[PDB]
């Protein structure tokens, strides 16, 4: 293997606080008292609605990803019962900015050691993520950007995983053939099936929870990582063949 590509969710990073709590905490500070559960439901609905009409951050239909997220936050609060856009606007701006701050995130235990160990083996690393343009700066603020040759977001690529074009663009940037590249992430469709459709290897991080039936029934156990601790061992069984 020569290249390992990564998504960041439940592999490298997770949000420190649930969204409802985060939105509610911010709102309280700014004089709006909204229940976290109301915001979590509002957000679910707002995010889905926005994606319905403006897929991949609206970039193909006249929006910027910052505007897309402002729209989602405004609508989250609206559904939660705060319709005054003047009142929410500043809250939305702080949430948008805070998203990039390292204190928003927890780097998973052992993730950075795993990246360092991959590099010491001579692997090139890169990111392939359905994330907006803020991902680069998130990684930089956490001291993780240094490990990666590039960070290819769906915003930058113009197509999200599992579309073959995002993987093909990563391979072009890496100057690598698919057979020497492996992708690692936590979503069956986006991170397991997607890369394999262009001939890359892929490994699915599933956590300690019992398996999704489709994964259980359809994915070889050799490709299933309960945690990142299992990645290098999985790669060695691949190489050993």
From Swiss-Prot:
Which is a Pfam family this sequence falls into?
Answer: Hydrolase
Q: Which organism is it from?
A: Homo sapiens
Checking PANTHER family in the record gives:
HALOACID DEHALOGENASE-LIKE HYDROLASE DOMAIN-CONTAINING PROTEIN 3 (PTHR46191:SF2), PTHR46191
Lineage of the species this protein comes from: Eukaryota, Metazoa, Chordata, Craniata, Vertebrata
**Modified-residue entries (N6-acetyllysine), positions:** 9
Query: Which family does this protein fall into?
Result: Belongs to the HAD-like hydrolase superfamily.
List, alphabetically, the SUPFAM superfamilies matched. Answer: HAD-like (SSF56784)
Give the protein's recorded name.
Haloacid dehalogenase-like hydrolase domain-containing protein 3
GO cellular component terms given for this protein? intracellular membrane-bounded organelle; mitochondrion; nucleolus; nucleus
Q: Gene name on record?
A: HDHD3
Q: Which Gene3D superfamilies match?
A: HAD superfamily/HAD-like (3.40.50.1000), Haloacid dehalogenase-like hydrolase (1.10.150.720)
Q: Which UniProt keywords apply?
A: Acetylation
**Cystine bridges: which residues?**
none
Q: Which residues carry this modification: N6-succinyllysine?
A: 9
């Amino acid at each position: 293997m020569r290249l390992l590509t990564w998504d960041v969710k439940d592999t490298l990073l997770r949000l420190r606080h649930p969204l409802g709590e985060a939105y509610a905490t911010k709102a309280r500070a700014h004089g709006l008292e909204v229940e976290p559960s109301a915001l979590e439901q509002g957000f679910r609905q707002a995010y889905r609605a926005q994606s319905h009409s403006f897929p991949n951050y609206g970039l193909s239909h006249g929006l910027t990803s910052r505007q897309w997220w402002l729209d989602v936050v405004l609508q989250t609060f609206h559904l939660a019962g705060v319709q005054d856009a003047q009142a929410v606007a500043p809250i939305a701006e702080q949430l948008y900015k805070d998203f990039s701050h390292p204190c928003t995130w927890q780097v998973l235990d052992g993730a950075e050691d795993t990246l360092r160990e991959c590099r010491t083996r001579g692997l090139r690393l890169a990111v392939i993520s359905n994330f907006d343009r803020r991902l680069e700066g998130i990684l930089g603020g956490l001291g993780l950007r240094e490990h990666f040759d590039f960070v290819l977001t769906s915003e930058a690529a113009g197509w999200p995983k599992p579309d073959p074009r995002i993987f093909q663009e990563a391979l072009r940037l890496a100057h690598m053939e698919p057979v020497v590249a492996a992708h690692v992430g936590d979503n069956y469709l986006c991170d397991y099936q997607g890369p394999r459709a262009v001939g890359m290897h892929s490994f699915l991080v599933v956590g300690p929870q019992a398996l999704d039936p489709v994964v259980r029934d359809s994915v070889p156990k050799e490709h299933i990582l309960p945690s990142l601790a299992h990645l290098l061992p999985a790669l060695d069984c691949l190489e050993g063949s």
